[PDB]
């Protein structure tokens, strides 16, 4: 009767049908049985990584006993679930806990083996002392109490294997994680338990996707557990959608009910610079109130003539998680991908050969054609200076994230000595900086969709190349802590400045003599950039002037530029040895200097608009 | 406190509260953990969820759920004996 106070009844719980169906894993359960039914030392311990199913095996054995598939040596035996936490509850006096545990042990021995104690998280059996969890050591080695335990793989060697007198009384059972084909079956069996809790239906083509998809995207966790979450979340989200309106009709309404209040409390601003902001916000409101009322119409076109989860809700879940977009190109993204070297051309000018290669390994990955285990694209573009090869790697990180500072840049010119490698991989255990991990590593392990940029790579020491050697071609590198980080979704970009003027084989042979063939072989196309012709500078001129104008709008201060000045600046863009950097200095020598002189000398105030005009030699405002 | 009007208004962050709710109402292992750099708003989201529950914008399963803010500091206050914690 002391076993009623400190434990529940697993077999009784399994009798009333309160446990999930256990599928497969025949070998593990048969070994648990043939260990649990020997003369002495008859107590197994399941062992293995967290999530692969180790309480599932004990619950399967309990259901199996209740049914009657077990041998004669185990027919009609009850399994009790010991609870070490509720025993040390009130034991402040000097012997009460030992008294409790002794009563429990005596009561277990008082039966004739009709009880199988099952301790979960048994690594907690070492403490309870303050000579505790130690009075069990005699009864263990004789086979009185049949113990079924299950702890993860690495708290075993941390709490138990430290005590080789106690770990002798345990027989280990290793529980390896299943494969995709087996996880599919486990899900096929468990589906009808979620189909009830959520009032929905789940499609087998979705049960296959929730297991194939969650095997190449979520690598930090193990099997089935990392494949049941997708199904459960998809169902819960679908039920939410069923009750209320669908998504993308809810957020459009939530933000509209906010822009209203914004413009309402903004229109009462007795101000003049705030009138250009109100007249700009008042347009996005009418633009949103357009597609909102279009969605409410397109929803009735379907509601007059999305009721079970498919292989699409799963992808949407594994995309909201982990940030990686793996969807189906829902007709809004494809129209944007189709004109990409057109949205990149607003920031980079020329280099058509290189824009149509960076942009070419994004489509052939969003359409599901690239190798699923290798980086999305790994190519190095190199050429003369000031040509636009560090700008392209920023016009690209802005097309995908809408923020130029959401990417990972490391300036490879500080890696002059080989010992500077530990800066991006961590320091081995037992050294100064170890509870910090790597620096490149920990940056990608948190958001595995960024675009890495190794700037000025040939200035480094030829060992960091050999570190990168396996990043390309496999997308993996492990830090000090032993955590493997995957790169199979990033875009690897390496700039350079080799050759410096050689036509095509003074540079192609200067790359070959600075890098090794095993490093050139992992790369995709080696893009060559080209100098700037006189025509393709008259356009960078416009870009620069637009930039400066946008920078000036902090004072509502514009400026008018005449075509003579616009083609004077571009003709004073000179020296096809320095690219397009001199022009940014010419602009500030000509316009910016005298504008700033006039600006703090009175005689120019906000709201004005200054026209530039080419004096016979210089520019006059 | 959300009923008594003592929490600041919470603006924006719709995707996050949506995901928090849908994780908070699934069958097993429903424990959302807001993670991210310090300052970007992680208590503000929970306060927004509380005000949203008081208002009524939540799905059916989360009607009248009475969020509770635990405290493990005042729980280990005086427990020098063997089982007091």
């Amino acid at each position: 009767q002391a076993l009623q106070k400190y434990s529940t009844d697993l077999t009784a719980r399994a009798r009333e049908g309160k446990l999930d169906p256990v599928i497969g894993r025949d070998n593990e359960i048969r070994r648990v049985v043939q260990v649990l039914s020997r003369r002495t030392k008859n107590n197994p311990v399941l062992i293995g990584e967290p999530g692969v199913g180790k309480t599932a095996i004990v619950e399967g054995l309990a259901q199996r006993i209740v049914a009657g598939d077990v041998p004669e040596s185990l027919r009609d035996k009850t399994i009790v679930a010991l609870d070490l936490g509720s025993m040390v509850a009130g034991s402040k006096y000097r012997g009460e806990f030992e008294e409790r545990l002794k009563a429990v042990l005596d009561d277990i021995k008082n039966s004739a083996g009709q009880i199988i104690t099952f301790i979960d998280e048994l690594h907690t059996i070492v403490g309870a002392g303050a000579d505790a969890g130690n009075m069990i050591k005699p009864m263990l080695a004789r086979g009185e109490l049949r113990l079924v335990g299950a702890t993860t793989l690495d708290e075993y060697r941390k709490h138990i294997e430290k005590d080789a007198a106690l770990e002798r009384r345990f027989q280990q059972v290793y529980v390896g994680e299943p494969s995709v084909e087996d996880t599919i079956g486990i899900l096929r069996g468990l589906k009808d338990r979620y189909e009830v809790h959520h009032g929905v239906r789940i499609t087998d083509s979705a049960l296959v996707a929730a297991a194939t998809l969650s095997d190449r995207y979520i690598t930090a966790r193990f099997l089935p557990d990392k494949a049941i979450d997708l199904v459960d979340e998809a169902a819960s989200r679908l039920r939410m959608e069923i009750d209320s309106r669908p998504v993308e009709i809810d957020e459009v309404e939530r933000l509209v009910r906010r822009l209203e209040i914004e413009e309402m409390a903004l229109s009462k601003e007795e101000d003049e610079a705030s009138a250009e902001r109100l007249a700009k916000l008042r347009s996005e409101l009418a633009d949103q109130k357009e597609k909102l009322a279009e969605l409410t119409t397109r929803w009735q076109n379907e509601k007059n003539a999305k009721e079970e989860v498919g292989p699409d809700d799963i992808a949407d879940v594994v995309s909201a998680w982990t940030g990686i977009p793996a969807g189906r190109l829902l007709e809004g993204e494809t129209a944007k991908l189709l004109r990409m070297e057109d949205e990149l051309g607003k920031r980079v000018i020329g280099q058509k050969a290189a824009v149509t290669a960076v942009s070419d390994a994004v489509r052939r990955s969003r359409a599901g054609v690239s190798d699923p285990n290798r980086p999305t694209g790994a190519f190095m573009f190199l050429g003369p200076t000031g040509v636009g090869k560090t700008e392209l790697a920023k016009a690209l990180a802005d097309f995908l994230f809408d923020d130029e500072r959401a990417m990972v840049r490391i300036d490879m010119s500080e890696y002059g000595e080989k010992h500077t490698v530990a800066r991006l991989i961590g320091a081995p255990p037992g050294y100064v900086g170890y509870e910090a991990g790597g620096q490149l590593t920990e940056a990608v392990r948190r958001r595995p969709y960024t675009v890495v940029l190794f700037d000025e790579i040939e200035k480094a020491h030829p060992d960091v190349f050999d570190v990168l050697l396996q990043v390309l071609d496999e997308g993996r590198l492990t830090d000090g802590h032993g955590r493997t980080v995957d790169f199979r979704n990033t875009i690897l970009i390496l700039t350079s400045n080799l050759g410096s003027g050689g036509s095509a084989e003074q540079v192609l042979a200067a790359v070959r003599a600075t890098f090794k063939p095993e490093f050139i072989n992992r790369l995709d196309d080696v893009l060559i950039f080209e100098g700037l012709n006189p025509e393709e500078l008259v356009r960078i001129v416009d870009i620069q002037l637009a930039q400066l104008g946008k920078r000036l709008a902090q004072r509502r201060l514009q400026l008018q530029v005449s075509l003579p000045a616009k083609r004077w600046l571009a003709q004073r863009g000179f020296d096809p040895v320095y690219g397009a950097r001199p022009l940014r200095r010419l602009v500030q020598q000509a316009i910016g200097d005298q504008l700033a002189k006039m600006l703090l000398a009175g005689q120019v105030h906000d709201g004005d608009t200054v026209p530039v005009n080419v004096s016979p030699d210089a520019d006059s405002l | 406190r959300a009923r008594e009007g003592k929490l600041d208004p919470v603006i924006g962050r719709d995707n996050e509260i949506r995901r928090v709710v849908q994780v908070l109402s699934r069958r097993t292992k429903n424990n959302p953990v807001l993670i991210g750099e310090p300052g970007v708003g992680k208590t503000a989201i929970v306060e927004g969820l509380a005000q949203r529950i008081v208002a009524g914008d939540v799905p059916e399963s989360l009607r009248d759920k009475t969020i509770v803010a635990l405290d493990l500091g005042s729980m280990v206050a005086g427990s020098k004996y063997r089982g007091e914690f």
């Binding site: - | 005086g78 020098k80 004996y81």
Partner: protein, 157 residues
């Protein structure tokens, strides 16, 4: 009953000084001497809260000890004191007995100590307000009781 460590130490000190004294039964004046001369004593500021002089709390109760003919057991007045103390702990729901609880039980249990505290000037309505101005609801030990005044100094003062 439900003891805290200070009442346990007071009972142990009174029992050691009683077994040294050689008595058939331990008087309440042993416990009173143990509590007024206790380290970190919360009885002398308790009587400071009700305006009682401390120059008589070691003389007029000392005369209740050196008139007895020098293992004792607890007097029935002391058991009634602990009984009314445990009863008086049920309103403020403090889970353990305290030194002020021992004091109010001794003031209600034996009328001999109540006679002395009434002759020095103290009412049970006033000494029930003696602690609330020095306390400020209770665990087992005593690390409350104006914690700002014992773990800080005043820069403005």
């Amino acid at each position: 009953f439900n003891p805290t460590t200070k009442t346990q130490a007071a009972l142990t000190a009174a029992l050691q000084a009683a077994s040294t004294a050689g008595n058939p039964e331990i008087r309440p004046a042993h416990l009173l001497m143990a509590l007024l001369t206790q380290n970190d004593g919360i009885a002398a500021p308790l009587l400071e809260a009700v305006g009682v002089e401390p120059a008589t709390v070691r003389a007029e109760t000392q005369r209740l000890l050196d008139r007895l003919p020098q293992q004792p057991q607890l007097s029935r007045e002391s058991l009634a004191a602990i009984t009314t103390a445990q009863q008086l702990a049920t309103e403020l729901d403090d889970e353990y007995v305290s030194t002020e609880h021992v004091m109010v039980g001794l003031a209600t249990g034996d009328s001999d100590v109540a006679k002395l505290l009434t002759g020095h000037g103290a009412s049970p309505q006033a000494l029930r307000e003696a602690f609330v101005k020095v306390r400020g609801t209770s665990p087992e030990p005593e690390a409350t009781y104006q914690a700002l005044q014992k773990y800080s100094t005043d820069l403005t003062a």
